[PDB]
Design an enzyme around this catalytic site. Structure first.
Site, PDB file in Angstrom:
ATOM      1  N   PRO A 188      16.119   4.651  33.423  1.00  0.00           N
ATOM      2  CG  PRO A 188      16.070   2.976  35.021  1.00  0.00           C
ATOM      3  CD  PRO A 188      16.493   3.235  33.618  1.00  0.00           C
ATOM      4  CG  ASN A 189      14.461   6.596  38.518  1.00  0.00           C
ATOM      5  OD1 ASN A 189      13.274   6.795  38.782  1.00  0.00           O
ATOM      6  ND2 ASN A 189      15.068   5.415  38.762  1.00  0.00           N
ATOM      7  NE  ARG A 239      17.827  13.687  46.522  1.00  0.00           N
ATOM      8  CZ  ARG A 239      18.491  12.634  46.987  1.00  0.00           C
ATOM      9  NH1 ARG A 239      18.811  11.625  46.183  1.00  0.00           N
ATOM     10  NH2 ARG A 239      18.840  12.596  48.270  1.00  0.00           N
ATOM     11  CE1 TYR A 260      23.005  14.949  46.147  1.00  0.00           C
ATOM     12  CE2 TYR A 260      20.780  15.704  46.667  1.00  0.00           C
ATOM     13  CZ  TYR A 260      21.919  14.985  47.009  1.00  0.00           C
ATOM     14  OH  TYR A 260      21.986  14.318  48.219  1.00  0.00           O
ATOM     15  CG  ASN A 310      23.005   7.638  32.195  1.00  0.00           C
ATOM     16  OD1 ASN A 310      22.860   6.667  32.958  1.00  0.00           O
ATOM     17  ND2 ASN A 310      23.214   8.892  32.648  1.00  0.00           N
ATOM     18  CB  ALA A 327      18.713   1.692  38.404  1.00  0.00           C
ATOM     19  CD  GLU A 376      27.723   1.208  31.899  1.00  0.00           C
ATOM     20  OE1 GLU A 376      28.532   0.305  31.604  1.00  0.00           O
ATOM     21  OE2 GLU A 376      26.974   1.168  32.906  1.00  0.00           O
ATOM     22  CG  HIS A 405      26.887   5.470  35.008  1.00  0.00           C
ATOM     23  ND1 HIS A 405      25.607   5.095  35.325  1.00  0.00           N
ATOM     24  CD2 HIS A 405      27.432   4.429  34.341  1.00  0.00           C
ATOM     25  CE1 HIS A 405      25.414   3.848  34.942  1.00  0.00           C
ATOM     26  NE2 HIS A 405      26.510   3.427  34.335  1.00  0.00           N
ATOM     27  CG  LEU A 406      24.523  12.360  34.279  1.00  0.00           C
ATOM     28  CD1 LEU A 406      23.050  12.618  34.662  1.00  0.00           C
ATOM     29  CD2 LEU A 406      25.107  13.435  33.443  1.00  0.00           C
ATOM     30  CB  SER A 407      26.908  10.488  39.982  1.00  0.00           C
ATOM     31  OG  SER A 407      26.360   9.192  39.997  1.00  0.00           O
ATOM     32  NE  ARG A 450      25.034   6.855  43.863  1.00  0.00           N
ATOM     33  CZ  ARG A 450      24.001   7.259  43.135  1.00  0.00           C
ATOM     34  NH1 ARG A 450      24.201   7.779  41.931  1.00  0.00           N
ATOM     35  NH2 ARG A 450      22.775   7.152  43.617  1.00  0.00           N
ATOM     36  NE  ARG A 492      23.504   3.434  43.793  1.00  0.00           N
ATOM     37  CZ  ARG A 492      22.268   3.563  43.312  1.00  0.00           C
ATOM     38  NH1 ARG A 492      21.997   3.474  42.015  1.00  0.00           N
ATOM     39  NH2 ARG A 492      21.291   3.781  44.164  1.00  0.00           N
TER      40      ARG A 492
END
Lengths: 146, 147, 147, 146, 145, 148, 147, 148, 145, 146, 145, 148
Positions: free
Chosen positions: A10-11, A18, A23, A74, A77, A98, A100-102, A107, A111
């Protein structure tokens, strides 16, 4: 020929929209187009799906059974919340990495929790889009051993 | 001026390739490092290495990197869970780093989920074996080549 | 017999004054120590010093203090959160100590609230910068001068 | 001239009354008289209040706004319990040092928790009355830089 | 002309159907219709979606980008569980107010946890349907400055 | 005993400071201005409104006790006491006058300790993060509920 | 080929017999070790020893034991609560070990209940003083003499 | 509105995979076979049985909502959603149709996170670890309770 | 002649005023007056203070130093929150018994925590007003030895 | 002569019956007979009781008061659960050593908790039946000092 | 011929004696007698013991070794507290099903913890006496394969 | 069935040791002496008192069960079982005879594990730290409540 399924959660469709000057300007379409070119160069058949719907990702995983050698995901959330996704991956028994970009450990503390990291072959976080490239290389390298 | 990258390996990694090779694998630390050196040469990058079982030696190496090192690649092994001193060395020198683990450290004991480094790292690669070092090096050079 | 005080500094404190001085400050560890030596001379006290990034070196120093040292001033840096071995060295030799931190370690990560030394220290000074060493020395000499 | 407010919290009026041969004979009045002499020597205008009432301490802090350069506070038991005191200090934006006579980390585990230590310039504990002297020196040293 | 999006989460379609003599008769359609009228009086265009599907709420939020000034959301059960919903809102950077009809602190302790409250402009709970009216007024007041 | 509703507004510690801390970056609105606006709103609704702000926990408890038999609803911004005062909770429970809890700022966007409350579970409802308007809405909510 | 056993002692154990002997006891580490050597000779077993305050030295000793050591007896002292690196050295070399503490470490601070070694040890002996080393040696030789 | 009981059987995510994962070591029984057997059992008890399996949380919620006024009891194997879905819990609470929770495997013999449930506390009862038979017993239990 | 100080914490002034047909009619003044009579029969001087103010209780404790043999305290809500009250009692070193009218373990879990119970001679809860009578007897019994 | 009481808790009567080719063939009767021979060699009077009943173990401990110098106890599962057993040992004030055949720290996390280990002279775990032999040696060694 | 042992833990002897108009009239003896009849129809020999004593349950389990094919147990309160009972079952290696009459997840949170559920073949709760019937059927079904 | 109240006194494990451990520093009072004093007090109040002390959890449970229909109130010093016995809690709940919990020592001044109880929340009340007198007061409390 090896068959690899790329799943984006998602997202991730919002990538590059953004405050891009802050970013980043890279979009999901660009990452996917980059990975398709790479896969074609490696003689890998790459399929992709991005969805905001948990059920659509689970269905894709179920549909991969018998025809897919590896999954690059990826989960965004959903890595923190979806036991159903974990059980889809476990149920079809296709190995996955798995991505993740960031860096998700930089964070919120919530998470740090994942229902996927412990059953993944491995995890790449914080390296931006390159993470997908590396994950694809790793998958092909593994598949090429056996 | 070519980029200079420092590769650090923490405790027990000198044992790689020696515990039940037919089961765990044959690749040794020296093989990984020597391969990474040749990869670095191909990218026109200088690569220095240190493996140590001594926390202080790793810390000293990080201090000594000041002013001559553009990026750090570190497989901290067990020290990732325990060493606030290493965290503070890295923060003190302000050289960006990537954290690398050969195995998936989330698939073992719950205590290995805790890290004093993963939150301050640029990123983390685990579970991909030796290839993780290659990817970390490529990542570092890509990041340096933009800025 | 004049009093003898041992000043110990833990890991990464050798970096003082080197990270972004216009932002974090210019005072170096050598400056702090040399100032404390002259303060000690004025109080008619002998002062020995060791800074190390090695836990074992600090422990050895504490062991070596037996029978020649009246008080210990220690800025343990990151080891305050992690080293049960240092706690046990201090308890083993039974020399009283004051714990000093330059910055307010309660204003950073929650993990820095935990200490293996603060409960067995005579007292603790944090957040007052280099002056904390001066105050700790005065405190020690005042305590020794009563007994 | 610098203006410094010394605040002493609950029960500190009992200093020197409980088993003094064991716990010490120094009284609060003696500490305060000692600090007044010191402040006068440094050309600092020192004001003091000890109270067992949380509201009285908060009111003193509010009244300090615009006329006080630094606060020295031994909050006693209120350091573990008073979010209102924290918010008074934050609201007036006067820097402060937290002082405890005894080492509060050598006692019950509940005494490790504080609503003030994280927003203080610094903390001194376990050094007895000297802690107040050092805190005053630190405050003057800071104020003298800028 | 301000555009505000009202989102209602899972099970809110059941409002007014369970023991109304006890829990009340107000239905979701009544609340939405009343709010629409209020919005018209404030020169606000109000759009609405209720869904039991997490993805449908996420899609609505994504579709609001560039055309919506504020979001009013009663996330119902998803406030406790949906990191994806949190990330949709963060990703589109439209301010929002969180609304709950009942006091969700007076129920099970698990209901105290939220993935939205900390990133909301504000939260209103326990005031029934009026909470939506107040959230709408708050939103307009903030946009009018 | 009249037919006109009477509402008691209580403001907890430090709220007297409103409008004094970095005005350019936090705003110039004072507590006095908020209360005077609420008094006008209440007049307009033909409802009586009493107010007390105090930094003393006991003063707030005493006000709650004194509301017995004359107050239909309590509006309270407890400020820091929401996290610490079991005594206030027990005053409100003891008097059985319904109340709404109000915070100017979003208290869930701050330190984790501010997530805990001894009042939010017994309040009719809670409004946070909407600034001074939260008082306006809480008063409207109170009157709306009493008018049923 | 006789069995070879490696006895490791961790930090601060060099202080044994020196803190308030009339209260805590007079037995020194050298006495314990020399007694264990003569016990080992009687069992026709070779015994090597190292005590160190340095985590790395203990780790190096464990690595060096590979291929020449049948069993490890270790009093890890404070490192049992803190050292994942020592755990990983022991797991890496796959030599069985027994964990020994002189005092009852469950009768002190709650933090001393946590160990990174007790779960992977063959067994644990605490609170029996120096005799615990004798029993651990007998246990090791009994286990080796079966297999 | 008839006198014959109507029971709704709900199966959550991944249950469509039954009988496909390492058949020799886990079994060849499919979800289709379990449901068809339960339909025969229900017929034998002169009770109507509806079924839905879905990987979509919303589909299960919608089915629960649609059961209002026509369903006497719900049998649900929520699979992974028992640990995560407050929304399903609130659907069941909203509709006030009693239910029994069913798991094929013993979920307490797995990861500790599987011990937590948002459904088990509001269910009439729970059956786990008895394989397909758990569905048979849950249906018997439902009919027995309705027949009282 | 023994001197005993009875302290009553916040909200205890409300005793007997909330739904007495349900919660009971006994008032604080009745309890105190009855206890005074009991004390007179035991040759005890009994002083009393009820307050909603933490500082007033602390001040009373401080003022008891040197003239009070024992403290009976119903701290009400402050037992869960007041480290300052704990430190007042520790500071003056007068033994005390903690009294609660209701069973505070039968209520919210937060009520299980106390800053006083561990330093009290003993605790009595759930026995209503008799708890004060028993505490007074206990105190006299202990002082008489 | 020294008098030592050996106590064995619940389920220890099953020793040597469960998959012995995997878990071991040594029975409780053999361990006890071995320890009796050892005690006789040391001039120790050894008494034994094994029970699955908590109350029987507590009664044995109470009955030991005044006539028993040391207790060797393998509490089995009761070490994790019995505050009553702890209070029996504390009440009679006879020193004891706690013995476990297996390494209880290598099993479920709940087995790390004990109501006895903190008040024991010491603890031996994971050394099999030898643990009893060593515990008896330790007890005699201690008793022989004073 | 299969042999099954039914064990009932503490307080289950009180079944049907507390407010039966509210909690039900079914007694333990009725449940056991009914189950015996069911067992006879399935060619199962059913043995039973109810006890308030932990050791008596442990002894029964030990005595089942070599002659019992399956155990059905309603451990009542001991499921939350008895490691000894867990170890008896593990030690004898007879499979078992755990039964509770009421839904023990709908009660105090302490009742969520069990020393038996993770090692049981399965668990049945909240279905009243039928739970025993279902457990017996499950056991026979498993033994018959 | 008589008009005279009957109270059952239960004493848990290890209480038989009273007066044997370091008498000079803990006291010489035995359990027998406490019970005999309580029997005299009960006689004086024209109330029947039964007593049982046991180290066996089941014996206490059986006594509670046997109190049904003949006992008006239970006084129990559960000793260590208050921290561990869910079975005793369920015996007391099963019999629905009110009880008071008594501890000789202040159990909150000891190890933190002694703060947990399976009985204190269902007891009418609790008395701790007052020594033998706690039994006297608990009996008075019981009779006072029954006499209402």
């Amino acid at each position: 020929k090896f068959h690899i399924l790329l799943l984006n959660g998602p997202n991730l469709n919002l990538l590059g929209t953004r405050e891009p000057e802050k970013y980043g300007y890279t979009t999901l379409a660009e990452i996917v187009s980059q990975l398709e070119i790479q896969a074609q160069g490696m003689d890998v058949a790459l399929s992709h799906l991005q969805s905001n719907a948990e059920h659509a990702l689970i269905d894709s995983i179920h549909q991969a059974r018998g025809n897919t050698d590896f999954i690059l995901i990826n989960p965004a959330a959903f890595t923190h919340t979806s036991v159903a996704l974990r059980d889809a991956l476990l149920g079809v028994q296709i190995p996955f990495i798995e991505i993740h970009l960031s860096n998700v450990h930089a964070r919120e503390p919530f998470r740090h929790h994942s229902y996927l990291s412990d059953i993944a072959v491995g995890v790449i976080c914080g390296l931006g889009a390159d993470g997908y490239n590396f994950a694809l290389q790793a998958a092909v390298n593994r598949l090429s051993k056996s």
